[PDB]
Amino acid sequence: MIVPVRCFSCGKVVGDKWESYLNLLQEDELDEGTALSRLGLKRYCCRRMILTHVDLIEKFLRYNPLEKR
Amino acid sequence: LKYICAECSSKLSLSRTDAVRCKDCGHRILLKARTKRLVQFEAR
Amino acid sequence: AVERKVYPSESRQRLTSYRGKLLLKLKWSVNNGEENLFEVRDCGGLPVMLQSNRCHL
Ligand SMILES: [Zn+2]
Ligand SMILES: [Zn+2]
């Protein structure tokens, strides 16, 4: 749903890396493997976490029962 | 203000034998609001 | 008190059925046309297929 905090296998913090990773692909126009490297994700353990994350939460958030649409 | 309208989202409260409906919309479906209360969890 | 649309989410939350009014135009013909009466009849709430030409989505 939202970025996981740690990499499942490494233990390495990964949750501070989602918003930046998107900005790398978007703004700096890098490919995925270059951007992952720039964020320090070396082990394929860790590259997998950010490479394949689906920010499904951003869908959930569009249904907010506490505001007049 | 215990309840919330499911359609217009107006926060509102009820009483003893009161119109089970939004006082703005007239929609007859109301969500019970989460109010300040202690629930305890273990971070595991 | 004039009609308002019902969307399927409401049906899901109320745990009832998502239905539209089924109307029949009844022809009541006396003596082979000599005198025929018409009346449109409310034949109940007919469950409607979601995302079809009778659904509001
Ligand atoms: Zn990893
Ligand atoms: Zn309302």
Give the gist of this structure:
This is part of a larger assembly, with chains A (69 residues), B (44 residues) and C (57 residues). Chain A is mainly alpha-helical and 69 residues long.
Number of domains of chain B: 1
State the secondary-structure class of chain C: mainly beta
Shape of chain B: elongated
Kindly state the percentage of residues in helix of chain C.
10-25%
CATH fold-level assignment of chain B: Rubrerythrin, domain 2
Bound molecules: zinc ion
| CATH-assigned homologous superfamily of chain B | RNA polymerase ii, chain L
Oligomer: part of a larger assembly
The secondary-structure element order of chain B is EEE
Distance between the termini of chain B: 33 Å
- Largest sheet data of chain C: 2 strands, antiparallel
* Total count of helical runs of at least 4 residues of chain B: 0
Ends distance of chain C: 24 Å
Total strands of chain C? 2
Number of strands of chain B: 3
Which H/E pattern describes the elements of chain C?
Answer: HEE
Main sheet: strand order of chain C: 1-2
Derived structural class of chain B: mainly beta
Please give the most extensive interface between any two protein chains, plus how many residues each contributes.
A-B, 5 and 6 residues
- What is the name of the CATH class of chain B? Mainly Beta
PDB class: transcription
Keywords: transcription, ribosome biogenesis
Entry title: Structure of RNA polymerase I at 2.8 A resolution
Chain A: DNA-directed RNA polymerases I, II, and III subunit rpabc 5
Give keywords.
part of a larger assembly; 3 chains; A: 69 residues; mainly alpha; Arc Repressor Mutant, subunit A; 4 helices; 41% helix; flat; B: 44 residues; mainly beta; Rubrerythrin, domain 2; binds zinc ion; DNA-directed RNA polymerase I subunit RPA135 (chain C); DNA binding (chain A)
